[PDB]
Design a protein around this ligand. Structure first.
Ligand SMILES: CN(C)C(=O)c1cnn(C)c1C(=O)Nc1ccc2[nH]c(-c3ccccc3)nc2c1
Ligand SMILES: [Mg+2]
Ligand SMILES: [Zn+2]
Length: 313
C-alpha cells in the first residue's frame, strides 16, 4: 500500500498556504483532494478504490452554475485542510476524516438559489425542510452517495464511529447556513472573553467546527486580490440570476440580487466584509490563533474594496 500522491513542486509548496488557488485544470482537482486527505488524516484512513469512486460521484452531483460548483467544493476542502494542518493536535482521527468530506459535499446539487427563493417559489424541498432548506438537502445527497455500492468510504469503522462521523458531517454541513453563523459567532465571542470556552465540551467543539465551516465557505475573501475580484464576478452572476427569478414571481429583489444596482457592488462588499467576513475570521483567530493569515488576507481585500470606491481602480 505504497502509492503516495505527489504534486508538482509549486503546488506541493503553495498547497500548504491558506491563499492557495486550485487552478483551472478540473482533472487535477481529485488528485489535489486525495493528497490533502493523505497528508491530513494518513494514507491508511480510506481505501483508495472506494475514495476515488466517492469523489467522482460527488463531482457528478455538483451542477454547472457560476459559483456553487465543484471548484467551490474543492476550494472549501482545501481551506479546511490548511486549518487542520496548522492546528495538528486539536482534532480527533474522526474529525479530520469527517470535515474534509463535509467540505467536499457541503453544497451537493446546488442550483444557485438561496433558501429564501425556494420559500417564495414554494419548492418541494421547502415543504420537506422549513429551515436550512438547501443544507438539509446537501446532507441528504451526501448520505445517498455513501449508500451506493462500492462507495462506503467508512466501511472499516464500527457501527459507533460510523454514527459519530455522520453526525460531524451533518452539523458541519448545516452550519454552512449563513443565517445560523451570526448567533453561532455571537455565542463563541462571549464564551471566549468570559473564559468559559472548553474544547472537551462537545457542545463547544460543534460551535467551533461550525465557525471553521463558515470560514472555509467564505474563503474567496482570504485569497490574493485578483482571485477575490474574479470570484466576486461568479458570486454576483448567481445573485443576479436569482433576482431575475424573483422579478418573475412579481417580487422586487434585495439590491445584492438586483443586476440594475451593479454600480453599488463595491459599497455592498464593504458591508459584507464589515458585517460578516472580518468578524468571522477575527473570532476564529481568537479560538485558533494559527488561522491568523485568513484574517490578515481578509483585511487586505477589505482595503482593496475601499480602493475601488475611491476611483484608484
Ligand atoms: C451568500 N454568499 C455566498 C455570500 O454572501 C458571499 C460569500 N462570499 N462572498 C464574497 C459573498 C458576498 O459577496 N456576499 C454579499 C453580501 C451582501 C451584499 N450586498 C451586496 C450589494 C448591496 C447593494 C448593492 C450591490 C450589492 N452585495 C453583497 C454580497
Ligand atoms: Mg451552501
Ligand atoms: Zn459553499
Amino acid at each position: 500500500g505504497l502509492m503516495q500522491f505527489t504534486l508538482p513542486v509549486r503546488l506541493c509548496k503553495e498547497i500548504e498556504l491558506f491563499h492557495f488557488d486550485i487552478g483551472p485544470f478540473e482533472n487535477m482537482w481529485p488528485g489535489i483532494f486525495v493528497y490533502m486527505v493523505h497528508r491530513s488524516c494518513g494514507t491508511s484512513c480510506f481505501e483508495l478504490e472506494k475514495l476515488c469512486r466517492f469523489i467522482m460521484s460527488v463531482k457528478k452531483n455538483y451542477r454547472r452554475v457560476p459559483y456553487h460548483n465543484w471548484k467551490h467544493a474543492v476550494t472549501v476542502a482545501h481551506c479546511m485542510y490548511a486549518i487542520l494542518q496548522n492546528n495538528h493536535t486539536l482534532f480527533t482521527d474522526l474529525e479530520r476524516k469527517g470535515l474534509l468530506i463535509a467540505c467536499l459535499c457541503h453544497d451537493l446539487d446546488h442550483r444557485g438559489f438561496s433558501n429564501s427563493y425556494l420559500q417564495k417559489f414554494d419548492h418541494p424541498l421547502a415543504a420537506l425542510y422549513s429551515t436550512s432548506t438547501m443544507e438539509q438537502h446537501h446532507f441528504s445527497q451526501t448520505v445517498s452517495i455513501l449508500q451506493l455500492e462500492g462507495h462506503n468510504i467508512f466501511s472499516t469503522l464500527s457501527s459507533s464511529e460510523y454514527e459519530q462521523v455522520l453526525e460531524i458531517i451533518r452539523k458541519a454541513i448545516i452550519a454552512t447556513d449563513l443565517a445560523l453563523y451570526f448567533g453561532n459567532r455571537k455565542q463563541l465571542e462571549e464564551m471566549y472573553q468570559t473564559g468559559s470556552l472548553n474544547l472537551n465540551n462537545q457542545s463547544h467543539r460543534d460551535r467551533v467546527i461550525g465557525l471553521m465551516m463558515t470560514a472555509c465557505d467564505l474563503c474567496s475573501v482570504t485569497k490574493l486580490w485578483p482571485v477575490t475580484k474574479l470570484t466576486a464576478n461568479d458570486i454576483y452572476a448567481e445573485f443576479w440570476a436569482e433576482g431575475d427569478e424573483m422579478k418573475k414571481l412579481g417580487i422586487q429583489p434585495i439590491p445584492m440580487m438586483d443586476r440594475d444596482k451593479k454600480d453599488e457592488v463595491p459599497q455592498g462588499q464593504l458591508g459584507f466584509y464589515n458585517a460578516v467576513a472580518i468578524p468571522c475570521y477575527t473570532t476564529l483567530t481568537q479560538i485558533l490563533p494559527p488561522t491568523e493569515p485568513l484574517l490578515k488576507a481578509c483585511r487586505d481585500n477589505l482595503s482593496q474594496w475601499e480602493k475601488v470606491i475611491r476611483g484608484e481602480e
